[PDB]
């Protein structure tokens, strides 16, 4: 019967601080290395266990969903689900980290369909740049499976972009070109004057445009004839119901316009007849800046880029140039991890693989009989040499095809290339290694 | 008035045939705005369950929105004829695809997918043979789903409904009776053909290049042995099939054209009455 | 595009036929056969789905009920914890094929804990009756990973007793003990007389006595004083919220008694002191039935078995000694499914293991030189062999301790036991591995 | 009255210590009646939310049903002091397991979880040390553990309430500061040391035949290195102790004392305020 002083502010600190860490632990603000909400990150740890076996095999969303609770997500498998569908479809992404089959939506309707009729999958995309998965750092709480944050080799963060909202911060990033983000990430790898990564919306056909540090997203449009209008594109942010309802309805209610929808597999698309009451000057920038002021196709957006960097800890970047950098910086120190891990496996298979070969050769020859003996006796025999000191039980677990001898001078030629990649791994710099990496991906 | 959720197609109400697709949610209609023909592909999504009809008095059916919204965007009043039938006095009878099909004067028939006046097609000099008005075969007539029934006028913009519907349960104790049992305010829609239902596949194949649909699981079974390397995916509900796979489900559609029988007065009142 | 002509009458048919099947699939009476109803079913192939790594290892509730659904159940995740919650627990089971760890309930409070604390696997008695599950009939509903239905040994539906209730068909069935099932159901096997089993509840220590077909449950009494007695036992329906609201409050409400709660771990328990207002009769006889009469004692119980059939249609039986020689009837049939795969199975092994014998001995001596040669080469040089050619792949990529003196010894004697057991299984009939596999049961 | 989910203890205002244990969950409370001492340890179910305490009258306190039913359990009235304390005008020091304890002459001291008068006490020929009232330390003696402040009579029943609640976060965002505040609105019930709080092990050990109490993470990280293969079981909750480990929490439990200080009247209003 131990009894304890503990006294009220003592429970009452530790009735806080524990929402304190259980918001903490799932906060809408994305990470810097792998750009993860950790919702995100859950549901993508779920998708690839779930693609170990079969690696083109679409899942059920409903299963994605719900097997995170078993991984450490604690808001239930409806954030997954809404998680999985921005994730997967490739009108609200411009590098999809999740293949999808199924409806996702699209820019015209982003609604996807039900979470059990649509199917998901870990695309070509999160393999071709999330490596080295493996050197991940460990979470801090043995509960949660998924790793501290996944390691891609571009700040995938620029990519898709991210927008949230926190109690007491606000992200906010714009989608950046694969094209322009791996040109700026090589340039910082060689320590270049970084190029400011130029902003790509996928499945966007308009125009983008910097102003003041205020990026304005330009649509496009086309006058057929004198009172009516082909709008051939509209910013990112609208989608058919609400531009509709939010821009033409008014304005018809009004009387200005009498609109045609013709918006099909080409995106956005409206057909636009204008009534005598609308007034149209005839200067022609002046109309066009009417018309991209009352229609609606000029947006403004900025950038509040405020990211969790490595070590856990809120950190707001004033340019993404600062984020690449930073980020070149981690992985490098990432990339130096698998360098000396690499050089590691390679010198033990080097060592294994020379084994085999001189068993092989030894037994072929005329030096090891195991022509009638006892299994311990052989292994004793052949392990009080001293090249064959720890690896007793691989070197006798060859299989019987090895003592031919086509077999034979595989595994010589097979030991020889571990010799050349094992000097290769010696030989080369983080710089070579992340050159090379960042080359594959498209 | 204006309804938000009225992807409309160009052809509406311009004495010309629209297929308006009554699509169950807002999220399966996604494909329908990229795969419509842009003329007569209308689409109206409905999420949620319909409120039985039957026996249901006219004047919540108005203040209920969804159902208040079906006859504001295909036209109707309830409680009026849908339609105006035409008189006539003359009856024909030909062969179609090696099938009898009886047709009148004044009759619209459907060669390759599209309706042919009877009179422009007399002028095509293919055999008519004419018989008696007590030698027709009423039943046969009305069963005929390449015959359209002596059209004058119409108050609709919409010619037809097609409806699209889940396959697994999410569809079956829901709206797929319920919307019959609201359209048979009109019953000449259904005996004139206009109701129909998209058959949407339970089963797809995916052997080489292009693809097999079977409908239901009896035929999947019975042809699957003549499947080289086939697999399998589910269509449990719409949101299951991908663009190109519900663009050729829309352009080729295949229809489940429901009829009334004589004892339509009563299966709607042993289900869901 | 085709227009066909389904009319209207085929539509109320196949919204009929989908809903019937809906609920065919969700028949709330169990299957003879394992007693499982389809609910369970789902739990327990979960539980076995989870349980491939660590036998042994306990997985949360909400884990276990979570992935019913991609198993092919439909009612949600809800019905599957309750399932497993009445599954694990002892009180409620006299054969619990799951084993569980925390708040399962009791018999005096029947409400387990949360699903999300409280942990289930399947339990050692699962595995020693449950048996020839790979065997089970293949649903006809490819979406149904469960078999049609499980393989238990003995009854389980009389081992942990039933009650389901379904359109216009109800099931109730006596929870009858282990051993006298097991009996009865070997008589069976043996063609004997098949004794009526006896019906004993779990965690019951009162008496149980069957009257005109109708099983009367009393519980057990003492008189400690005059007005003073100490009930031992109560009927197995009560526990101990509703018995009191329902027979002690109402009437220490009416004034006739003073009870306490004497609730131990020794199961149920009330000390009860009676008042002036009560009236207590000299005759023994009397006493005891009024006794039992008003403070609730007896209840009277009716078996309504009806269960489901191998056929998969709806039968009832008048007696449980029917449902034992149909339940063996139908066991002898898949236990000779055992019989003859494993005969196949004993003779290819046989075969297999011989000619890997084989190897060795030719090799040793002077015959096979695999001493130089290529792999081609030699897996066509010893094809030709007619024994040989069967097995090759297995027989050459085999390892190199088996040319050892004591892997010699120990292939030939693999093969020799093989050989034995290959003759046993051929000279064994239903009756004989149906009486040996019906003695683990403890 | 009587309450339905009273699972009591037989010395129940017999003037005797009684453990009324207060668990969420009338699962828990499984647990409970087949491990109670039958003597003193009562026990209430409560699963829920208690509302906010803190902004609403007295007078309406009884509306909702389970506060009032913990009153009636307890005995408390609300308004009135839960104890009357008897005067006194003498004070004593000694050292107990290498501590000083200040006490008074009409106190109880507890040793080994029995509670033994003062004046008992000095009759057992044990060193004791006579101080001024004026230089007791009056936050010292307010903070020991092992005094009572001189009960003299309480119409309250059940001596002691253990609160016993979940530690995931049903347990932190819970019950436990609701109740807390509840049983605020006595202040000499936390001073008398009565109020108080069963841990629950967070991480239990499976080395040997025994086990390994881990009452937090830190603990379980700062000794993991001399356990020998050891086991880990994460206590989330109530129910996820079995029946042993749950007999052994309760007849040889560790207690949360939860004392109120003079800033009280703020931490209210800032958590759940």
């Known amino acids: 019967m131990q009894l304890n002083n503990r006294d009220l502010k003592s429970i009452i600190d530790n009735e806080a601080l524990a929402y304190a860490m259980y918001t903490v632990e799932n906060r809408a603000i994305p990470n810097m290395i792998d750009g993860f909400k950790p919702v995100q990150r859950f549901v993508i740890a779920r998708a690839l266990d779930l693609a170990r076996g079969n690696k083109d095999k679409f899942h059920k969303l409903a299963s994605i969903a719900g097997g995170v609770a078993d991984l450490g997500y604690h808001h239930g498998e409806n954030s997954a689900q809404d998680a999985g569908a921005l994730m997967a479809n490739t009108w609200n992404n411009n590098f999809p980290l999740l293949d999808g089959q199924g409806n996702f939506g699209s820019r015209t309707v982003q609604k996807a369909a039900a979470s059990r009729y649509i199917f998901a999958r870990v695309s070509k995309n999160f393999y071709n740049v999330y490596k080295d998965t493996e050197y991940a750092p460990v979470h801090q709480d043995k509960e949660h499976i998924p790793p501290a944050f996944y390691l891609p080799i571009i700040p995938t963060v620029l990519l898709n972009g991210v927008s949230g909202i926190a109690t007491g911060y606000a992200t906010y990033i714009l989608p950046h070109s694969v094209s322009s983000v791996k040109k700026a990430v090589l340039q910082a790898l060689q320590g270049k004057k970084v190029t400011k990564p130029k902003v790509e919306f996928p499945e966007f056909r308009g125009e983008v445009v910097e102003i003041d540090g205020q990026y304005e997203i330009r649509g496009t449009y086309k006058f057929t004839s004198r009172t009516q209008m082909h709008i051939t594109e509209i910013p990112y942010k609208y989608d058919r119901e609400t531009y509709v309802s939010k821009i033409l309805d008014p304005l018809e209610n009004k009387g200005f316009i009498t609109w045609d929808d013709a918006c099909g597999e080409h995106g956005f698309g409206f057909k636009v007849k204008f009534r005598k009451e609308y007034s149209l000057s005839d200067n022609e920038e002046e109309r066009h800046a009417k018309i991209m002021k009352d229609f609606g196709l000029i947006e403004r957006r900025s950038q509040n880029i405020t990211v969790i960097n490595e070590k856990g800890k809120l950190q707001v970047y004033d340019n993404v140039v600062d984020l690449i950098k930073d980020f070149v910086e981690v992985r490098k120190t990432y990339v130096q991890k698998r360098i000396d891990n690499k050089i590691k496996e390679t010198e033990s298979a080097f060592r294994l693989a020379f084994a085999k070969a001189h068993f092989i050769k030894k037994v072929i020859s005329g030096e090891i009989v195991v022509q009638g003996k006892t299994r311990k006796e052989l292994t004793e025999e052949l392990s009080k040499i001293d090249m064959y000191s720890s690896y007793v039980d691989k070197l006798v677990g060859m299989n019987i095809f090895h003592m031919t001898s086509d077999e034979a001078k595989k595994l010589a030629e097979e030991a020889k290339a571990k010799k050349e990649e094992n000097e290769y791994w010696k030989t080369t710099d983080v710089v070579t290694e992340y050159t090379k990496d960042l080359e594959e991906i498209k | ?273």
């Open chain 2, 1 to 273: 008035a204006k309804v938000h959720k009225h992807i409309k197609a160009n052809l509406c109400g311009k004495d010309a045939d629209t297929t308006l697709f009554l699509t169950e949610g807002d999220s399966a209609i996604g494909y329908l705005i990229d795969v419509r023909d842009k003329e007569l592909h209308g689409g109206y999504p409905l999420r949620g369950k319909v409120l039985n009809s039957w026996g249901m008095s006219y004047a919540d059916m108005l203040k209920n929105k969804e159902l208040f919204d079906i006859c504001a965007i295909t036209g109707l009043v309830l409680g009026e004829k849908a339609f105006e039938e035409k008189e006539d006095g003359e009856w024909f009878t030909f062969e179609l695809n090696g099938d009898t099909i009886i047709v009148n004067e004044n009759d619209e028939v459907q060669i390759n997918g599209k309706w042919i006046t009877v009179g422009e097609l007399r002028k095509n000099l293919m055999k008519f043979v004419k018989i008696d008005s007590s030698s027709v075969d009423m039943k046969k007539y009305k069963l005929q789903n390449n015959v359209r029934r002596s059209i004058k006028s119409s108050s609709m913009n919409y010619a037809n409904v097609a409806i699209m519907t889940d396959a697994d349960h999410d569809g079956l104790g829901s709206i797929y009776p319920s919307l019959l049992g609201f359209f048979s305010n009109w019953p000449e829609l259904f005996e004139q053909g206009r109701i129909r239902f998209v058959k949407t596949p339970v089963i797809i194949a995916q052997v080489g290049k292009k693809q097999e649909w079977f409908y239901t699981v009896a035929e999947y079974e019975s042809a699957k042995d003549a499947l080289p390397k086939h697999s399998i995916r589910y269509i449990k509900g719409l949101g299951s099939l991908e663009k190109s796979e519900y663009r050729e489900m829309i352009q080729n559609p295949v229809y489940d054209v429901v009829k009334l029988p004589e004892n339509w007065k009563e299966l709607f009142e042993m289900l869901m009455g």
